[PDB]
Design a protein around this ligand. Sequence first.
Ligand SMILES: Cc1ncc(Cn2c(C)c(CCOP(=O)(O)OP(=O)(O)O)sc2=O)c(N)n1
Ligand SMILES: Cc1ncc(Cn2c(C)c(CCOP(=O)(O)OP(=O)(O)O)sc2=O)c(N)n1
Ligand SMILES: Cc1ncc(Cn2c(C)c(CCOP(=O)(O)OP(=O)(O)O)sc2=O)c(N)n1
Ligand SMILES: [Ca+2]
Ligand SMILES: [Ca+2]
Ligand SMILES: [Ca+2]
Ligand SMILES: [Ca+2]
Ligand SMILES: [Ca+2]
Ligand SMILES: [Ca+2]
Ligand SMILES: [Ca+2]
Ligand SMILES: [Ca+2]
Ligand SMILES: [Ca+2]
Ligand SMILES: [Mg+2]
Lengths: 524, 524, 524
Amino acid sequence: ASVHGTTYELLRRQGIDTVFGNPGSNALPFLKDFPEDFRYILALQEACVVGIADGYAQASRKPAFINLHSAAGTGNAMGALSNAWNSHSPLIVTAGQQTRAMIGVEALLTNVDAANLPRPLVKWSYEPASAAEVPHAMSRAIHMASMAPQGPVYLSVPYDDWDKDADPQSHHLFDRHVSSSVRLNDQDLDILVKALNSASNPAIVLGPDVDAANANADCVMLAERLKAPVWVAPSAPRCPFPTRHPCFRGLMPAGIAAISQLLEGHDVVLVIGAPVFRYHQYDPGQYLKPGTRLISVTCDPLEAARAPMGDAIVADIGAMASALANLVEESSRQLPTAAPEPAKVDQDAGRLHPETVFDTLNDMAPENAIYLNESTSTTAQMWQRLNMRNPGSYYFCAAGGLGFALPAAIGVQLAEPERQVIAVIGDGSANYSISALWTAAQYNIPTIFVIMNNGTYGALRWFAGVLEAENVPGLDVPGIDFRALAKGYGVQALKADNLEQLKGSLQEALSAKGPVLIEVSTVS
Amino acid sequence: ASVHGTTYELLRRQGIDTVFGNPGSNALPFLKDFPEDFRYILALQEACVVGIADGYAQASRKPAFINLHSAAGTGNAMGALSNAWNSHSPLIVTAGQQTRAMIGVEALLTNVDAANLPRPLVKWSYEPASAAEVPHAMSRAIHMASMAPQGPVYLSVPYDDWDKDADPQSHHLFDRHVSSSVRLNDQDLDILVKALNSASNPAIVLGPDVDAANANADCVMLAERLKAPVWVAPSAPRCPFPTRHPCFRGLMPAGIAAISQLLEGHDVVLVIGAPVFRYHQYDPGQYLKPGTRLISVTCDPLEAARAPMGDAIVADIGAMASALANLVEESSRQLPTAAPEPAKVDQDAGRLHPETVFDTLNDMAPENAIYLNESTSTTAQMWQRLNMRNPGSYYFCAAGGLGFALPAAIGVQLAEPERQVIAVIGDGSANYSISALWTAAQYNIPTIFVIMNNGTYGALRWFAGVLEAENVPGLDVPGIDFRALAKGYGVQALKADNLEQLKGSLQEALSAKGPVLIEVSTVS
Amino acid sequence: ASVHGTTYELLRRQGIDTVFGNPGSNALPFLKDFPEDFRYILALQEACVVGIADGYAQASRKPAFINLHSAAGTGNAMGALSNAWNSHSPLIVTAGQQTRAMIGVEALLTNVDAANLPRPLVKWSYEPASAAEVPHAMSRAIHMASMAPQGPVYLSVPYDDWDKDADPQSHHLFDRHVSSSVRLNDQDLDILVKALNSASNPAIVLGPDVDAANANADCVMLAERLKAPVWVAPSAPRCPFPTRHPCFRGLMPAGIAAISQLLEGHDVVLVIGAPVFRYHQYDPGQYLKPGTRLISVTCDPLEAARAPMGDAIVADIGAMASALANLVEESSRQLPTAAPEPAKVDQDAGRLHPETVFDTLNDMAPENAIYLNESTSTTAQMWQRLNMRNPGSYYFCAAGGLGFALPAAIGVQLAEPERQVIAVIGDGSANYSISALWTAAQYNIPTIFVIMNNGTYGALRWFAGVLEAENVPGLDVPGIDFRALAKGYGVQALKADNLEQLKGSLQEALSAKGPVLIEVSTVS
Ligand SMILES: Cc1ncc(Cn2c(C)c(CCOP(=O)(O)OP(=O)(O)O)sc2=O)c(N)n1
Ligand SMILES: Cc1ncc(Cn2c(C)c(CCOP(=O)(O)OP(=O)(O)O)sc2=O)c(N)n1
Ligand SMILES: Cc1ncc(Cn2c(C)c(CCOP(=O)(O)OP(=O)(O)O)sc2=O)c(N)n1
Ligand SMILES: [Ca+2]
Ligand SMILES: [Ca+2]
Ligand SMILES: [Ca+2]
Ligand SMILES: [Ca+2]
Ligand SMILES: [Ca+2]
Ligand SMILES: [Ca+2]
Ligand SMILES: [Ca+2]
Ligand SMILES: [Ca+2]
Ligand SMILES: [Ca+2]
Ligand SMILES: [Mg+2]
């Protein structure tokens, strides 16, 4: 067998059937004879390739496979890999390298010192020392991406390796099963359960690895048993809990003092599937108030090590959430009371308040819609205004790297064809990965893109205002016609300059058979 | 003085007056109070930021200064840095980091292990250990980018450093002059001159560092004295010689055997300002034929070390070219005969042959036009069909990384406001950095963009044909309306479906007062 | 030809004839059939291997070739490489890797991610992608080590590559000549010469790259012409000037304020072949006083970039020193007056003051002796008390890494068989690389080792005293019998408990036919 044939067999046997890519000559011997049971999804720039694959992996809860061209293609994707690292996204990034005979002279298209290129944003990065090693290296990549804590990996493969003979002993790779589905030993688990049962005023904080594990329902059971309020850890990449459940208390503000004050009076705070914590703004103060004990369950040693407070348990989130949900006592305390309806912001017949947009989406979208957020000045209001009952309903760039949501929404929609995806993207953010729109058109992936056009990098103008920072350049982005950009890439385009038109455009978009972009004029 | 004030003083004293950027919160304390004598050039994605800065640096022959946001912004620019590394572009890449107090917890927006991120594509990469070190680190960055061999450098700066007190002793940084304007010692230079004077059939090969040094005219003198044919080294990022000079022999094919055969019978081959060699295709054979001696003059130790053949001298290209041009004898051999006119390809009233496009550009464009090439299947014909008399007239992605020419053409045009820039970009290539168009519109930088629309990644289809590789996915890019994309970003848009319309559109574009995009329907 | 045969041919053709090594199985296919024209020098631990090679390279002014075993052997040598980096020592470090078929499984003896292991202490670090690349990679290593600024490089080679067929086109590697023997262009050199000729009170500071270049005599001429005092840059790894020449002013103290005060009133300070500056102690103040201009000539861009003050010129030290020495005017100012005799410290009939040891060495040793210093509390007195007339007469661990001088003295003695080497090593320092003694015995390399036994890490006790730091552990090293250690490794051993015995032992040692260790009881 060739390295090509053995590698595709390995991929298929390991459940991979899609290649997200932007092609180049170094990968031609890999892409030729492309198997009929695989699908190739082309995107026009590598940030888009990786963002699409990332959304697909996150929504499908399975690894996604990528093929890029050399250093330039890898390089173009490195901002996307920063997000993938923070979201624990299981991405297998392969990159075509020059033929081994041309590497020493540093021929054009050579990826110099290739494995160092994507560091520090990958779990594992490698170039095999021989062609016959390639299937084994691919196996390593699959499992490194897939083991807890999941994350992106990188494999560089010389052009000429594919046609070479594989090791017949590579068949042993095909059906390997590798599990990290582990939970705390019984003795120490019983000690934790007892501490939860004994808490007088517990609280729960949930992060993105809950949603990745589909541990949401187990966390609902846990919260109901403990009669505990539930917060989403700050800077949330995903939504881990039904947002109209009576225990839900919303998104924690990303500040040290803000969080310890929210947690004050809670004697035990159980954090599941989050870093402790993904703070953002400078908000100095106490990590916890006196009287609060924190216990973190994380899938990631690097998270456990860096928490500034609390105990930690490093284990699989799904296995821990299921165990805890089934072992805790039913508390006799009263269930928390649901948060009220948010207020309706007054809206005239002019430009749209963001709040109006989110209220209208919540009203009109299917109850199993999936939202993406890259509208950076409006996140808090979005989280208060969307009723998201189901898992897998929300994604936000986990490293704050713009250019995620537009391509990721395409990958999520590909993963979840029955669930309408609605990406709410600022006018600034929309440009980073604009060319991803083409993939939605070409493959008829019916994502809806809602562009929040306020003319500015509003979150930066706001921050500059908080600082009283004057004379800051580069904060405005006038003069972008998003309907023309959508036409450029073959996506149906609508506008909404007022609420009547927003409702009209949403109605049209929700019934369309293809992707649709709606440019919304929002208050600036 | 603050670190902010001292750093801007250092930059101004070192000749920097422009910041190419995409802003973020980590850089707000750097960008606030932006000096009135500086200009900020915003671009919408970091590949575009760096490509614009790169064109500006390459054309201006001086360092360009960049400011990006954290890991995601840096990451989005890493494909652009792959090109900058290969072109020896003096780029000072700064990236905003989190406040030092929030780095340990890995707050959102922290650039983890920041200095490793852009490796291996930078000459120097650093994060200072204290605020007062920042001006010194900036000095290091300026000089590392600027010393031969020039190249990109990276500096990560925590948010909170800018407002801190600077070291008063940082004034010693302001006026440092650092020179690498060096040439071979007299004794060994005389030995080289004697070998050149004694050669019976010399040839000269020139690379991009000649044009970077503005050594072009000295190389013309050298070639005339030696009566030597002159080739451009393969995969050429720049044009180092007048392309209708009688000695000019064009672009070398990027193959081992092809080059040794071209050089056969030449007893001494003098290579100046190129790697030996930037081969591309697999073309195995002899590095040199018997009877050919190669001598390389390079500004880059890494080039000298990796050449598979020949002697080398590591020195400044400008200083070596001037010395050699003035020291060699005038040979009594006959001057080489100019290459003939290329043939005119037959052209019907339909879609344009690329050859027709280049012939028409050569006819219509000013004699001091500057061309960029990212039309990958047409490079050989472009090089034969454009009379480029002047230095600084040609740029091509030096690492083969697409997404260079569109933004770089904007930066070149900004550097050279009196010289009409014409970027010839394939339909595939145009997408990688499409959003750069906006910068041209916003700042009214009057670049002309000629999109070669053949519907495909033609260079890849061709290669697949050479291989007889079947069933390769992802090679076609139908369904892109480049006039709509140009409208999206505020750039005047024209079409050319036939030669009459090409001439009409070029006439209109050449007289426009702003940037213009022309979508050309080319034979596929 | 095999890779083995081609590689040894390359090494011989490039002037390499000695392999400094500690063997292992991964290197057996390299070491077998060891050519009869090469010599292998075994040392018992890899810090010793590299230190011996380093002394040999520094004294011989040519690259030295090393072979180590995998990661553990490389790792054991990394402290030695820290010194080699700071001394610009041209060291070609090769390390045996596992067979390519066993690398993926990470068999015992695999060097994982090998090229990253010695970073950041090497100029270039690499593992070839195929066997036939190995000769080319070796060529790269030779030239990278040898080009200015010289330094250590690393090459990892899989076991199985050696027996494979080489590329016949690797013959083009054999006789490559690569030069970095460059100096400032004439126009700018004339500007520098004019500034030197116009200075009213110039001073000269010289660093180790002067001695490496054998630029010493040119610097003497330069100093005599300019009538300038000459200092050695701080933390000196080498001696660049005759220490009883009338211009000589000794070793600069390694502090910021101390140096600017020494330079006060000097209008132009010319630094040659040094960093600006290798400060050590915290001594804050002005980098230069008002009225002092500094101009640095350095072979190292990294030095030029990081200087906090002054202009810089990056060029070959030998070529610049020769040019400047021959171009400056003869000043009419008076020649500086020689420094007086240092005082004689009162010495009773008991333990030896270090000053007494150095005075006695200066009296008794041949005028062409070579000294090494790893007696860290006595450096200033050593520099004042040894008349070192000739180049190549002094070495001190350039990164401050102990374990250098004992092995390096063996390599220096091997390089310079006619010059008696005398290594003055503290009792603490002697242990780091103690096993190097064996190599001197086995090869009968007649180095003299003078162990300064004060029972302590005296430089650390002194520093702790300056700080008034109490309760510091680990500063004393009682209970070491250096004569027994010398016997252990087959080296003749002497003691000196008083001055009479010191003179007796030195007399015996100087006339011995083999290496000799003298344990001196020094005042503590
Ligand atoms: C790749 C990248 N570049 C720059 C930024 C900095 N950035 C920028 C540029 C923001 C403004 C986004 O503007 P928008 O129009 O998408 O949304 P708002 O107007 O609601 O802020 S928010 C933010 O962190 C980033 N996070 N990621
Ligand atoms: C960033 C990046 N991604 C992918 C490639 C691979 N690539 C691709 C995708 C090419 C086709 C470009 O198509 P085009 O339409 O711009 O021009 P032609 O149709 O004339 O080839 S040529 C080439 O090397 C690359 N070099 N750089
Ligand atoms: C490898 C290494 N380890 C530790 C040190 C720290 N160190 C130590 C341990 C010194 C004392 C050396 O003691 P000595 O006996 O050799 O000489 P003195 O008694 O004259 O100080 S000086 C110094 O910097 C070092 N520089 N290098
Ligand atoms: Ca409602
Ligand atoms: Ca699915
Ligand atoms: Ca906005
Ligand atoms: Ca014509
Ligand atoms: Ca200009
Ligand atoms: Ca095309
Ligand atoms: Ca004396
Ligand atoms: Ca010798
Ligand atoms: Ca001691
Ligand atoms: Mg990296």
